[PDB]
Amino acid sequence: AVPKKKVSHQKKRQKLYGPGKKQLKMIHHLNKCPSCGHYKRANTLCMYCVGQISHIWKTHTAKEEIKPRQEEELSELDQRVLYPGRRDTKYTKDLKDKDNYLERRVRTLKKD
């Protein structure tokens, strides 16, 4: 059930980094993207190009932002009177700063 002795620095090292299985291999399998000569994994669509395509689709197949009929011609003063902007809670604020906790896809290097 339990270790009989403190495992020596050597022994643990050799258990961990010793065998091949436990080592990270080098990703040899990667090649040029036909559309823009950047690196991409083999047998795999380039993540930039596809993303771009998706974006374009979104732009084209964008749904109509259903803006209400009343609020478009609603006086600024009137609006202020109606809907005064409150202070948001800490949690809400945190949620809002997406950049802090949310990751945007990185771009690869150019293959040569």
């Binding site: 990270l24 080098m26 990703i27 990667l30 690196y39 994994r41 990185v106 690869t108 290097l109």
Partner: peptide, 10 residues
Amino acid sequence: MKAISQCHFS
């Protein structure tokens, strides 16, 4: 550069 590339795909 190679290292960077490797990182990208790890």
